[PDB]
Amino acid sequence: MDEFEMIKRNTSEIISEEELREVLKKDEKSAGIGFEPSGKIHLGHYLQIKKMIDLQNAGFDIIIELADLHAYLNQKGELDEIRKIGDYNKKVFEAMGLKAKYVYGSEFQLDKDYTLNVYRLALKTTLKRARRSMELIAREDENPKVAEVIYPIMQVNGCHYLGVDVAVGGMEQRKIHMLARELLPKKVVCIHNPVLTGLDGEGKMSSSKGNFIAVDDSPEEIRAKIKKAYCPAGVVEGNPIMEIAKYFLEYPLTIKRPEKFGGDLTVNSYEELESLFKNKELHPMDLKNAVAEELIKILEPIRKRLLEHH
Amino acid sequence: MDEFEMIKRNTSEIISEEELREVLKKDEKSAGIGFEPSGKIHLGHYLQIKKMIDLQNAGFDIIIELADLHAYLNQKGELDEIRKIGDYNKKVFEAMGLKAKYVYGSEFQLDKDYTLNVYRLALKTTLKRARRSMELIAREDENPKVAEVIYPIMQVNGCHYLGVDVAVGGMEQRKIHMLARELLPKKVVCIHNPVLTGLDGEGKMSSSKGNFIAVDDSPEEIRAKIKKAYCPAGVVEGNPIMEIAKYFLEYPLTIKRPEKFGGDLTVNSYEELESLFKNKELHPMDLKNAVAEELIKILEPIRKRLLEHH
Ligand SMILES: CC(C)(Br)C(=O)Nc1ccc(C[C@H](N)C(=O)O)cc1
Ligand SMILES: CC(C)(Br)C(=O)Nc1ccc(C[C@H](N)C(=O)O)cc1
């Protein structure tokens, strides 16, 4: 498991693999990601932070953008309230064990030269290309605002201004990332993580859809959320419980169940688990119990560090 | 002819007349207009500058924006070349007899607080409203740029930042102006001048359509441009020669013609001229001769001041 495959583990795509290999050669290399401040930090965020921790462990300097101005452009409210939530998110990201530089976007995204470059990019980005890149990001609006098409080019320029070698994000960021690769003089290596399914299976996990496990949920809340979740026997695709087993749990994995249902089960890889699940050797109730208890233990240190403040 | 009707003469609309009357009450009041720098200054510009001269004569302080950044957003090239053309335009506007403050937009349109307010406005302006306001302004593009929708909200904010009581422009600016009236806390009085017809009658006069008389055209060039112009007998609407008689000439007007065509004609108002033209008492050839020679004399001082530099 070289550093490449360590970075590559559980990503949806790397754009591009050859470029990432060149970047690994450098003594000095930086990786960046941004987050619109969120009232709750959920497993979708945690997935990203894990991936930033991998990069850090491969010798990357990590830059986290607390994207207060992007959230302002995406209709999350007033900058001061956004910035307060930004500060809470940093604490959560630190309680996740991430050592990084944290910057508020508004610290640099309003300088004369940043703005001028945003306007340069606005001359090279068609409205159609801009609106396409925001399809999975833009706040739902029957009357889309001009702010929606400023957003993607400000994120592009952020890549430029921060000078990262690698940009990380969920797959929803990939069209903004493609735009950065076409417009900017230095091509940024782009690493896209999968988009988790919502707990009810009905769509993608979102802080505004209320279908997530938050990293500071109480254990009873974790158990009740898993218990209700979409999780049909033998169905792996779009199954948020299997996604959690694949993305967050440690193997080998011991799955406790009564002797009358086969007794404790040990699986040495998520791949074995998927096999046991597909040919319906492992029942959804037992998968849920094991996933909930392991997730509880995995999230425990984070919830404890956050509760230590009170 | 109070100051109101003097300001109102030969305008298409005043938004609104009651508001303009309130503004006239003030000892201190300012009027503003912007121009994307243009290689040639034509009668469309001159019409506007005349209207600024009226306002000045009514006691307005005049602010002319040399809109280098708007022209940059509207694909007129590089800022330095735009700014050079900006400087030429000022000279022309001064040779027209306008005493005013001249500012390059880029002097203030990149400050942190200006930019932040542009982004505030971008949150309140729908893409559809923004693209509607640019229909008569935007450079022709099969693939419209994001820059096209930044333009109108930057012009709105310019009104705000410069604090004018009155905004002046051609009718094509009216939708941007309407947006300023809805978004800004202080409603700006908007004065819209007519859009001149191109010399060939086929559309509106434009510096990029090459259908204009420039204020520094030589007399032979003026005569040849008038001679070729669209100008059908009895047709007033869309007739650029009548527009010039209405908007630029001084009355009473003596129209020279041979005795065999009726001999010299004196008309005491454009209204008489329109009457003589409609019931086909005045032939297009004689109208053209008179319009060209009077326009030559009217533009003479401007062409001379511009030529004095060489
Ligand atoms: C400048 C660097 C490279 Br650190 C960066 O990635 N900036 C960035 C990234 C993502 C977001 C939010 C995002 N579009 C979302 O959907 O939440 C905002 C800013
Ligand atoms: C700030 C004040 C009030 Br002085 C102003 O009117 N600014 C302004 C006006 C017009 C233009 C150009 C115009 N859209 C065009 O079509 O040429 C650019 C800037």
UniProtKB/Swiss-Prot annotation, chains A, B:
One annotated GO molecular function is: tyrosine-tRNA ligase activity
Q: Where is this region: Interaction with t-RNA?
A: 228-231, 283-288
Subcellular localization is given as: Cytoplasm
Q: Which reaction does it catalyse?
A: tRNA(Tyr) + L-tyrosine + ATP = L-tyrosyl-tRNA(Tyr) + AMP + diphosphate + H(+)
Record field: transmembrane: none
What InterPro entries does the record tag this protein with? Answer: aa-tRNA-synth_I_CS (IPR001412), aa-tRNA-synth_Ic (IPR002305), Rossmann-like_a/b/a_fold (IPR014729), Tyr-tRNA-ligase (IPR002307), Tyr-tRNA-ligase_3 (IPR023684), Tyr-tRNA-ligase_arc/euk-type (IPR023617), Tyr-tRNA_synthase (IPR050489)
Give a yes or no for keyword Acetylation in this entry: no
Q: What keywords are annotated for this sequence in UniProt?
A: Aminoacyl-tRNA synthetase, ATP-binding, Cytoplasm, Ligase, Nucleotide-binding, Protein biosynthesis
A single GO cellular-component term from the record reads:
cytoplasm
Q: Which domain of life is it from?
A: Archaea
* Chain intervals for the UniProt region annotation (Tyrosine): 151-158
List of residues binding ATP: S207
> Any idea of its EC number?
6.1.1.1
Annotated site, Interaction with t-RNA, chain positions: N143
Q: Where is this motif: 'KMSKS' region?
A: 204-208
Which segment of this protein is annotated as the motif 'HIGH' region? 37-45
Where does the chain bind L-tyrosine? Answer: G32, E36, Q173
Tell me which Gene Ontology terms the entry assigns under biological process.
tyrosyl-tRNA aminoacylation
What PANTHER family does the entry give? TYROSINE--TRNA LIGASE, CYTOPLASMIC, TYROSINE-TRNA LIGASE
Q: How does it assemble?
A: Homodimer.
- Entry's family note: Belongs to the class-I aminoacyl-tRNA synthetase family. TyrS type 3 subfamily.
| Function recorded in the entry | Catalyzes the attachment of tyrosine to tRNA(Tyr) in a two-step reaction: tyrosine is first activated by ATP to form Tyr-AMP and then transferred to the acceptor end of tRNA(Tyr).
Please give the name of this protein.
Tyrosine--tRNA ligase
Q: What gene name is listed for this protein?
A: tyrS
